[PDB]
Amino acid sequence: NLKPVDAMQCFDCHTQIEDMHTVGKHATVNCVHCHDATEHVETASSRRMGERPVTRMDLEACATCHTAQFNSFVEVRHESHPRLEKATPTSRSPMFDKLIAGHGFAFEHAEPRSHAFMLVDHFVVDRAYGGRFQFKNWQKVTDGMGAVRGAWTVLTDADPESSDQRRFLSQTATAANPVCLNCKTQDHILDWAYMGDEHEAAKWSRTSEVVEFARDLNHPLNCFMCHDPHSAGPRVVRDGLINAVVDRGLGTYPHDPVKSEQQGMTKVTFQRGREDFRAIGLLDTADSNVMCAQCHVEYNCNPGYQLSDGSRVGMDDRRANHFFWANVFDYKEAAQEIDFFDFRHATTGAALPKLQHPEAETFWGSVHERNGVACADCHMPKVQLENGKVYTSHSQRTPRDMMGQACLNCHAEWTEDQALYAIDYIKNYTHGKIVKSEYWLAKMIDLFPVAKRAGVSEDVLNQARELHYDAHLYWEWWTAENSVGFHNPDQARESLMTSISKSKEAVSLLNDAIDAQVAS
Amino acid sequence: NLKPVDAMQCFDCHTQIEDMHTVGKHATVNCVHCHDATEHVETASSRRMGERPVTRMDLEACATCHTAQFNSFVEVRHESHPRLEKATPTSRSPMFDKLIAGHGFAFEHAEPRSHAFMLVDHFVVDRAYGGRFQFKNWQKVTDGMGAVRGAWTVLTDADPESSDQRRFLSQTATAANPVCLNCKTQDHILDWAYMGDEHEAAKWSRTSEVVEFARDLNHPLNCFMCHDPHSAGPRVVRDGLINAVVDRGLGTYPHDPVKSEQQGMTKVTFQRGREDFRAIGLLDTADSNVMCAQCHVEYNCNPGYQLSDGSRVGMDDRRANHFFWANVFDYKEAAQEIDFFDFRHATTGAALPKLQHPEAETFWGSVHERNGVACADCHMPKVQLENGKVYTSHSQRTPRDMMGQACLNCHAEWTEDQALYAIDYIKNYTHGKIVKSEYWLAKMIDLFPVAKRAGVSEDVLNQARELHYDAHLYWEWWTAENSVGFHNPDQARESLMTSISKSKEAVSLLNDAIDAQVAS
Amino acid sequence: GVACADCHMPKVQLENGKVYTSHSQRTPRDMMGQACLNCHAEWTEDQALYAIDYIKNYTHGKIVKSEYWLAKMID
Amino acid sequence: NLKPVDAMQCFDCHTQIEDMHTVGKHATVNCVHCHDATEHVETASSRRMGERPVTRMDLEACATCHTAQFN
């Protein structure tokens, strides 16, 4: 059985913790629930750590007193189809392979599934670690609780004796790097300096061997990613988000200085050897929009190239850990701001961006966001009980599974069927425009080899390549974003119509140039 | 009412039957249930048949005493979508038409449905008989019991006065030949010599007019295909399977000599005029893996061409009735072994194999097969009754309809939803790789006209054609096979990654050659 | 060695989660999988219910007859 | 928000509770979750209760850490 430790002894050296812990709703929660610090206490001095204390990062550390939230969180939604490839005629992006050719996502890009699996799915996806990590067997794919208990309880490593990124299966890629993991786990929270910069106190950084880093990590989406374990107050821990909101002064709601002020973030820094080491962002309110934006954003977490001169931007560069914190119509300017693109298209040669799940940036300025609605209202609402103590559901999933609490409490005029119909109207319309955008992108892409082989000039090809950047951006935002337009239907419609406009312009340009070469 | 005949009188000339019948569980079942032999008995001699006895081939001959198994067998699974074309974006092979161009399956290749319909579906499919045979009207498509009663009770013939294979509808083919029927019916069991070789006692052979043959056949999947009617013991009757297992000494489990010995087959031959005529294979055990492998295999049942010199291999050749009895990674060697390919691709000119439903060969070496599981355990399990005499379900269908008996009795740790999720994980992953394999195959195929028109050398084109053979094989195995990877997920993944590797190699080869011709 | 809680407040079974003991003390009819069938693998839910009812029906018949005779005496 | 009390101070006069509390699975659960003893501690001796401390009997005293069982 746990025996409490004297927190006062701790507080004598840990004033920041004292100020948070003594004031919040965890004032009675003893340090022993999460820390084993006996040898630490025997050896530390005022400013030197001595022996390192053990810190529990497992979610069961919270489950002891918060079983309801834990159980809600680890639930697996079986209806969320597993390992479902997006590049298929029945999924999100029927022409993805042609459009993304040259990027690592061509190796595999599946639809998301339940949060319990985020770390194991990151480890096993074909694009990440060359097939190095796999489930112990095909049965383990169901085991949400097991994944939560630890990735390495359900996965194998093809070669424990090497630590280099390489392909163990022919059609895999090795795109994973240490920045990825910040959106899968925060087990490394005490071993990673702010932004993944080099730091004497950091075991891991942007430049680490990711296979070695991976083996040190176990748990998905730790409860403390949104809740400070000392104060129990709302927070974020994701460095890239703090950097955008605070360091770059953009605010929690970049479009709304008033809301940004009312619902802001305070950056709190922790030091090692009296030098800044790590940071968190304490929230003024329990604002899920900002909590979820730790991960559900467009980001850089990868090497790339400069737009200016095409030179390599490596993991060592700060730009390899970057939140653009920009909506689709501000994105091109945001990418120019850091002089960055992701890949060159394998067929057209165009410099292109790679877009990822920008739910937070898409939601901005939507009717629901402007009305003060937040992710949790639709995706993790309060539980309604005929008799019971209310708690917040932690099963982050589609509102279709809980329409009464997600939608109909606000929309009293509608039945469930009518609310579903309204969602489907938007999704169906948006998907049709996504498909049409892909059709026009593919038509343009297919003209590039014809143009080059007909002797069309580099000047015309480069014009078309500039059009490709825009056509790609205004399309891929929407295959990347998970709501199929629902989060901001007017924006999706304007963006996708712009993509088609750009592709059509490029098609006409190339067809005309080709025809002129044929006429001599 | 039936009157019993004196079996002892029969046994005086039929010693083989006596040895089987007197010993097995049909020792009390009188010959009159299946044979009308009055005139036969009056005219036969020790070694000459005299007047031919009537032998019932209808399944209702067994239904009289085995109603439960019969009723189970004739059940129609309405949820198994009928006449569903595989070459569509929502089915198995979205790019099938491009990839299979040059083969008869381009005319129609539907998903399989319930066993009751196998013979009528064979007769009516657009690729088989030039549209000659059709259901009497569109209502008959539902009539499983009617099809079982006899194909000609539900079908019409566009021209009873001719017997040549020809097109009655413009977009049909005439691919059917007498070998096909061996996997649809065994009504011809006494009229077909082993392998379909020419034989004085055989009415029908590989070289017969298939339209004439068709008119003589009525019943699907006769009960006696798996059960000897005389001994009631387990057997196979399919010549091609006996040939692979016994004549070629490959064994029932070619990968496992021990299991092959424990679960083997004994070839029993029946003679006409003291010359070998037909054969069956008696099984040591009631092994559904081998019973189902009578049909659910990759086979040759068609003319083709030699790999060596491209010369025609006709129905007269033994190779027109061939079970390769080889897994995907042994197939190319198996096809080289008999010097055979199926068709030349209409666009690329490559010699290609045609793969068909290799469930048996795919299942070999899988985790379930190695653990002693067999087709019937998942597809035709014992019925569970609160009160009753247990019998084996004969409704061969997906385990999704009976998960408790097919999966969960073995997998106690899982709910139905978890077991379904595990299946879908594998199927979703495999389908994504199938789609990607098709993308790369199509990309390569489309480069062939460009290459030929740019004046790329025959040497380079032939290199690409050799790559096409392998890319095609390692893809088509999996659109042909019905489990979408479930029967052997690691093998599907390795094979499909190989297909993509081959296509990518060919694409690079052709693109480079084209570009060199453009640069002069 | 069976106790009240085994039938009236059994452990919750979850596909994924931390097990806890149900504190809803109620008839096992509402949770037959966990209250009965985990021990009685030979039975379906309907068979287990049928066995309960056989006993309850029989006992209640004897209760009613006992009351009939008591009332006859009292009168 | 609840502020923890010095349980060791309590234990100087409550050895019977000490022997139970320090050993079981509530060793880390502070007295303030169920007792309001500020005035008691101001006035008690080991042989004189002084002001009577308040003890919570409501089930929500447990529901705070054991919501699943309470619900």
Ligand code: HEC
């Ligand atoms: C779980 C409910 C915890 C309780 C109770 C206590 N701590 Fe904690 N602590 C916990 C986590 C998950 C972390 C990682 C960092 C994060 O912000 O999540 C920490 C970290 C610390 C640190 C390091 C801060 C730094 O300099 O980087 C200290 C000094 C610390 N914790 C002290 C501490 C004390 C004294 C506690 C008893 C009053 C205590 N913690 C309780 C989780 C939990």
Ligand code: HEC
């Ligand atoms: C028992 C020893 C606990 C441990 C372990 C954890 N928490 Fe806790 N938590 C506990 C109590 C008694 C309370 C106060 C309840 C009340 O409403 O009075 C809390 C509260 C929280 C809250 C709400 C905070 C707020 O609204 O300001 C959160 C978000 C919370 N606790 C989170 C949390 C996390 C993430 C834990 C693991 C690191 C964790 N708790 C452990 C008791 C206990």
Ligand code: HEC
């Ligand atoms: C936070 C800014 C993230 C970064 C850094 C990485 N990922 Fe991610 N990932 C994130 C979210 C919010 C989601 C779900 C939404 C969605 O559109 O998928 C994911 C999903 C994945 C998945 C599962 C789906 C799939 O594409 O197969 C995988 C396998 C995955 N992510 C891998 C991955 C890699 C390799 C990363 C570094 C290059 C990486 N992620 C970073 C959020 C974030």
Ligand code: HEC
């Ligand atoms: C960000 C993605 C979160 C993660 C990770 C965790 N929780 Fe959470 N929690 C989150 C929100 C948006 C809320 C509601 C806040 C509001 O006031 O609207 C909560 C709330 C809690 C509470 C308070 C009681 C309740 O409302 O249920 C607790 C005790 C709590 N959360 C616990 C908890 C646990 C145990 C987690 C790991 C399994 C966890 N949270 C993660 C957002 C997020």
Ligand code: HEC
């Ligand atoms: C209600 C007004 C919502 C708000 C607030 C948020 N989301 Fe949403 N989301 C909503 C709908 C109707 C849908 C489509 C779901 C469906 O079943 O059709 C979605 C979708 C998502 C998804 C994908 C879920 C899935 O398909 O299984 C994600 C990952 C998602 N939304 C994230 C998300 C974020 C991060 C939010 C705050 C920035 C957010 N949602 C708010 C409705 C609503």
Ligand code: HEC
């Ligand atoms: C149905 C339950 C039957 C019973 C009863 C009997 N026979 Fe049979 N017989 C039956 C079938 C379907 C066939 C076709 C071949 C096959 O293996 O399925 C036969 C065949 C024969 C033959 C021919 C063997 C040969 O030389 O090719 C003979 C000589 C024969 N049957 C004899 C026979 C006798 C004597 C029976 C009474 C003891 C008898 N059969 C019963 C189906 C059934």
Ligand code: HEC
């Ligand atoms: C009644 C006159 C029958 C006819 C017609 C058919 N079968 Fe039969 N079968 C019959 C009996 C009395 C038995 C023995 C039952 C027992 O378990 O004691 C059988 C048995 C079988 C079996 C099981 C054999 C074994 O396990 O070794 C099979 C597979 C079987 N019968 C098949 C079968 C077939 C295919 C029939 C049509 C050709 C057929 N039976 C007719 C009685 C009668």
Ligand code: HEC
């Ligand atoms: C009476 C008002 C009818 C209605 C309502 C439906 N059906 Fe019908 N159908 C009817 C007749 C008299 C016939 C012809 C019978 C014959 O054998 O000549 C039919 C035919 C069909 C067919 C066959 C079509 C073909 O081209 O051969 C089909 C597939 C069919 N009917 C189906 C059908 C369906 C699905 C209906 C509900 C939408 C339906 N029918 C209504 C009479 C009437």
Ligand code: HEC
């Ligand atoms: C045994 C080795 C067979 C040979 C010889 C033939 N077929 Fe076949 N067929 C077989 C199986 C096991 C299945 C179901 C599994 C599947 O993948 O389809 C089929 C299916 C058909 C169908 C229905 C599905 C379809 O493709 O439309 C038809 C119409 C069909 N088979 C026709 C057919 C022809 C024309 C054949 C000779 C060229 C032939 N079959 C031979 C097994 C076997």
Ligand code: HEC
């Ligand atoms: C191969 C594809 C089969 C066909 C054709 C028929 N049956 Fe069958 N039968 C098959 C199997 C795999 C089994 C189970 C054997 C085992 O011991 O596991 C059976 C069993 C029977 C029996 C025995 C009693 C029982 O288990 O139900 C009988 C009487 C029987 N089968 C009858 C039967 C009938 C009437 C058929 C035509 C409608 C028929 N079988 C075809 C495999 C196959």
Ligand code: HEC
């Ligand atoms: C359990 C371990 C199985 C074994 C043994 C066999 N099959 Fe199977 N099969 C299995 C699954 C989970 C599926 C997918 C079904 C679904 O609904 O997703 C299949 C599929 C098939 C099919 C197609 C069925 C359909 O889609 O309707 C066929 C024709 C098939 N399997 C044949 C087959 C053969 C011949 C087997 C022995 C060699 C065999 N299966 C074994 C599970 C299992």
Ligand code: HEC
């Ligand atoms: C007994 C006759 C079984 C049947 C019926 C089903 N399964 Fe099975 N399965 C069985 C065993 C003994 C094992 C191996 C256990 C181990 O850990 O070694 C399996 C394995 C699986 C797997 C993993 C496959 C892999 O390649 O790793 C899966 C996904 C699986 N089983 C699923 C499954 C399904 C969906 C079934 C119903 C169609 C099913 N099994 C039936 C034993 C038996």
Ligand code: HEC
């Ligand atoms: C007697 C009628 C009880 C009442 C009053 C309460 N609980 Fe209980 N509890 C009881 C039993 C029989 C058990 C299972 C013991 C075993 O090991 O089999 C429990 C268990 C708990 C636990 C431990 C964790 C768990 O198994 O769920 C807790 C934390 C718990 N009970 C809490 C609790 C609460 C909050 C109560 C008031 C709402 C409560 N118990 C009352 C029996 C009885």
Ligand code: HEC
């Ligand atoms: C948070 C500050 C708590 C309060 C308030 C209550 N309990 Fe508790 N309980 C808490 C913890 C951290 C634990 C240990 C969890 C573990 O297993 O590590 C417990 C445990 C129990 C148990 C199980 C004890 C056992 O020996 O198995 C029970 C039955 C229990 N708690 C009951 C209980 C009651 C009745 C409460 C109101 C008087 C109560 N707890 C409050 C944390 C907290």
Ligand SMILES: O=S([O-])[O-]
């Ligand atoms: O404690 S030391 O820093 O004097």
Ligand SMILES: O=S([O-])[O-]
């Ligand atoms: O690759 S992750 O960003 O989905």
